[PDB]
Amino acid sequence: LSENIQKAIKEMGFETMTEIQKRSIPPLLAGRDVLAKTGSGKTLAFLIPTIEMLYALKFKPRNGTGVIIISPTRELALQIFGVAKELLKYHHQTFGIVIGGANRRAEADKLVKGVNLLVATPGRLLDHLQNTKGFVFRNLRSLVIDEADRILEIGFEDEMRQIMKILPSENRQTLLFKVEDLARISEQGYVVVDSDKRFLLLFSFLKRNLKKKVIVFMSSCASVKYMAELLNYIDLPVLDLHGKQKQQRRTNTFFEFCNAEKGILLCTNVAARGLDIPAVDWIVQYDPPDDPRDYIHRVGGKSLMFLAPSELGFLRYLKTAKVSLNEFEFPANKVANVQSQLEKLVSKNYYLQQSAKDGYRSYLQAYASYSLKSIFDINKLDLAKVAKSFGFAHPPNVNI
Amino acid sequence: LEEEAVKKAARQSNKMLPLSAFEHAYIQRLINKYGTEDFESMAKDVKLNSKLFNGSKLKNLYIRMKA
Amino acid sequence: TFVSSTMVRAAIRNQAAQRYVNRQESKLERQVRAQQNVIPEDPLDNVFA
Amino acid sequence: EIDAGYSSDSSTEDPYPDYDDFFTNTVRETPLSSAPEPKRRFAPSKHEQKRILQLAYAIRKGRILTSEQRAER
Amino acid sequence: YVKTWFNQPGRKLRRRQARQTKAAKIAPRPVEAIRPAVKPPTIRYNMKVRAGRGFTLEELKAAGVSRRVASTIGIPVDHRRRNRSEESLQRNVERIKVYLAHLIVFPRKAGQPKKG
Amino acid sequence: GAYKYLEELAKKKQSDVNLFLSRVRAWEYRQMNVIHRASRPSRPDKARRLGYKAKQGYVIYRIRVRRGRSARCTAEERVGRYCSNLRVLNSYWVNQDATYKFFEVILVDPSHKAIRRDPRINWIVNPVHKHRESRGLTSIGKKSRGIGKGHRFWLRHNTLSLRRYR
Amino acid sequence: APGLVVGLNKGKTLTKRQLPERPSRRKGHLSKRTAFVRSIVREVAGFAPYERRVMELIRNSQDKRARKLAKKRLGTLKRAKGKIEELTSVIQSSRLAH
RNA sequence: UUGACCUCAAAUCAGGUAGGACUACGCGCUGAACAAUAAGCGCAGGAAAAGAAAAUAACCAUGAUUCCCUCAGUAACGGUGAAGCGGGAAAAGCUCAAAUUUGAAAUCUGGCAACAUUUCUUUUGUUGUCCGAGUUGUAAUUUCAA
RNA sequence: AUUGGAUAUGCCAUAUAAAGCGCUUUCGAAGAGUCGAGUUGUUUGCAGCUCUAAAUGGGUGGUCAUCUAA
């Protein structure tokens, strides 16, 4: 490995190669098409060869893009981008991400001026590769596809056929993580809570069980930052897996929560995807999971579901999943109505407001990026009620 | 002509600025409370960050106060 | 039945385009011969010079 | 296939309807300003902070009478 | 309506005298600003190279000069011209780089208030 | 904020709101003199976008011209001749009917120290701009004489330039 | 030595660069705010007298004459097509609301 | 009612500005003979106008305007009669309208008071205060090149 | 004597400020009795009259290129 890459790996503590990375990273250094388990350190498996490859050719913003990494969903694209920015902090290459539901007028001028390393959603990649002008994608040297089964299950059939045709496969190796056809071209508890009272109920739940070990899963890393900032700002000290988007901080915070017999932690589905769940009294999924079949596998303390009254199709999904279930009732009279003080603080404060809207925008985009449309529909959910949960009396004007 | 360009630049070499009293005590109040490394966090506070400076300008004041 | 009247308009343009390049070539070809077709030194004319 | 049928109006041969609110019938639930909120609306005003400074200028150099000077004058 | 060219030697000397006062006003800087190299836009002269109006924004940024200062050190700007061929970007970036090699820049005194 | 909404409400000049206003406004304007001062522009957004700013020295005069040379170009020549000292900036259509066209003409006071000291409207104090409505240097003057860039837009023909050596 | 050397050629080797987007070419995009502004004013100002008669023809379902009337009033089909689509958008919205 | 705000007027109310003259060059309106022609009328400057592409072009593409040379007596029209191209002279770019400063009309003329200042006791400013202008929008900001 | 743009240097600086380049997980407003059509005069544009628009639109050139009017 290069000197620049080696020093950066020490910052996150990444020294020992993973079991999958043992037979992949040494082989990927040769730049050959090589085709892992959940949360098994894969992120570094297809990233270490790529950043080394860019340094081998000494890439610049002038030289267009050389590496493109494809992610099944928006959240996963965030995870890879977060790792990419930390390991490229000691390099002169350009790291970027283009995704669905983002400012394609600001996703385009960035590419025009020169982007070398790019992680993208198939929906947004297809738009750029076909309609964006000034994007220099004829000089691709590496192509990475992660979770092809998830990509195909989303509904990306025509997208892979169209996109992978555009990508110049000559002088390029492909990393792959119906799949062979693509490579051929190479117990549960739930609470019926309304959206407006969803945030209020969880705040009361944390208040009652302050002296117990609780972990809450939500669908956004931006939400993780917002709730942690909000709770710590209302005299509720909560640990989170975001920090300053430092992987070392996430490992330290997760490790500290392991020895701590009590506390409250916040992290996303992909944040805990593959991490060992410690002995925790209370586990809760705040937003509906984007991988329902992984949610049932992950659980297999006590589990809790935070569900809207208009999204009960997931309960019927548990019937088709043959998983036992139970319901927990709550009297709304005892739920604290701090909503009067909450939104007032949001309007008064600046940084807290900006976290809420970014978290709100990420919540809506992630919800719009769901797969089980027959269970979770964005149209069915009321946006006014959702905005109330985030601390906004009125919804912010987010582009879809 | 070239020699005069060097001498004129030599006179105009002190491009670092000092600090006035207001921003002086402004930076001490932030420094002694939020350490000296988490500039983003100290820009996130608003009780002492009256003017609501960003992290970039707070670091500039930290460098300028040195000399 | 032939091209267009404005497509014969380009017929001058495919006639006039090779004018400037031909003329420039004639300038250097004449000069190249000038270097070639020159009288020798006449070594007897440095007796007094 | 048009059948070459000729319109009967070919050239060759309530004044006050009620207010129709088709657009404002339903209330919009979001603003229109997609731009992010700036820093001005949350930080102390820089307009007076500039005016204050040049008022301190005029106070220090005696350009303008001070408040205590105003009372005694 | 007839025109006569009797002032032809008069006008030429007036132009030379107009150049000399310009040189007097702006001593160190050349009487003429630098111009780029471009190709005439026709099948007849397209293989030629001549001067342009000014350097496009890709020619300034690639060479390493901001667009605002370029107007001040004598490099002129053409917002309308663009680079479609890299050889057109190359012939004009190196044209800028050779110019900045021979360019002495006189320092200007700058206001330095006691506080900051 | 508002001049966006006023922009598209003025784009529909036969809608009921405008036509009902076209009758109401034309009736009361004909009741007045032919050329009369107007406090606030009858079209604030159009006057704004044409150069008018609500400050001293900026003036507006409304004039009706018989229908049946350009009508708007006429409004400028007649207003300027009426206000001999003001320099005419612009002009815009405000209203019309079966027998008249009502035009508003913006003028600037070249002597008012709010104008003379304004860095942006100073150019009008220079004597070269005396009565631009009379030379054809206003917008309608520039159009009505076919001045512009394009292919759709004399003595150079007749002259016989005999060079010194011919 | 800064010097322009004109004439002959400079080079026959060509490499086209994918040109960016100029913001003046961006003109004519439908801003999200101004669509709302245009729509609200269309509702407020009402409809033109000739354009009101187009609505009745659509309601009476003589669309053939509606095209003829708009074409006569406006001037070309595409100008008339857009107005008809603009008008029929009003008609359907009013009928679902009222 | 008071009194605000809107309009309406008057005053030897203060501060102003317009007219006529010249017309070689210049910008408009308009005009018959014998042709945007004379004339007629209107308006200016030391130049006037024009001017930073709703401009060419089909190229390896050029790049505000103006004048000169050529393109060319060519295309086109039907003898009238150009324009890109090219080569020269000269070169410089810009300001608004459309954004909520909204954590503060931040903008400006005029009166008065001192301070100054001068082609100058004849000029032109600043500071202070008061009054008006202005929220039907005066500053900053941004002009697509973004 | 009267002034002009520079240099040198003294004093004063209201800088808590104001810029350029950079990165953008947020944005990007664009000039109407105008363009356009029929029609009539003038000498292709311009002018009257009759109607009178659009938002990747609109003008102009060759499904493309260029440009961004009022």
UniProtKB/TrEMBL annotation, chain A:
<dbReference type="GO" id="GO:0003723">
    <property type="term" value="F:RNA binding"/>
</dbReference>
<keyword id="KW-0698">rRNA processing</keyword>
<dbReference type="GO" id="GO:0005524">
    <property type="term" value="F:ATP binding"/>
</dbReference>
<keyword id="KW-0690">Ribosome biogenesis</keyword>
<keyword id="KW-0547">Nucleotide-binding</keyword>
<feature type="domain" description="Helicase C-terminal">
    <location>
        <begin position="187"/>
        <end position="346"/>
    </location>
</feature>
<keyword id="KW-0694">RNA-binding</keyword>
<dbReference type="GO" id="GO:0016787">
    <property type="term" value="F:hydrolase activity"/>
</dbReference>
<dbReference type="GO" id="GO:0003724">
    <property type="term" value="F:RNA helicase activity"/>
</dbReference>
<comment type="function">
    <text>RNA helicase.</text>
</comment>
<feature type="domain" description="Helicase ATP-binding">
    <location>
        <begin position="25"/>
        <end position="186"/>
    </location>
</feature>
<keyword id="KW-0539">Nucleus</keyword>
<keyword id="KW-0067">ATP-binding</keyword>
<dbReference type="GO" id="GO:0005730">
    <property type="term" value="C:nucleolus"/>
</dbReference>
<feature type="short sequence motif" description="Q motif">
    <location>
        <begin position="1"/>
        <end position="22"/>
    </location>
</feature>
<protein>
    <recommendedName>
        <fullName>ATP-dependent RNA helicase</fullName>
        <ecNumber>3.6.4.13</ecNumber>
    </recommendedName>
</protein>
<keyword id="KW-0347">Helicase</keyword>
<keyword id="KW-0378">Hydrolase</keyword>
<feature type="domain" description="DEAD-box RNA helicase Q">
    <location>
        <begin position="1"/>
        <end position="22"/>
    </location>
</feature>
<dbReference type="GO" id="GO:0006364">
    <property type="term" value="P:rRNA processing"/>
</dbReference>
<comment type="similarity">
    <text>Belongs to the DEAD box helicase family. DDX18/HAS1 subfamily.</text>
</comment>
<comment type="function">
    <text>ATP-dependent RNA helicase involved in 40S ribosomal subunit biogenesis. Required for the processing and cleavage of 35S pre-rRNA at sites A0, A1, and A2, leading to mature 18S rRNA.</text>
</comment>
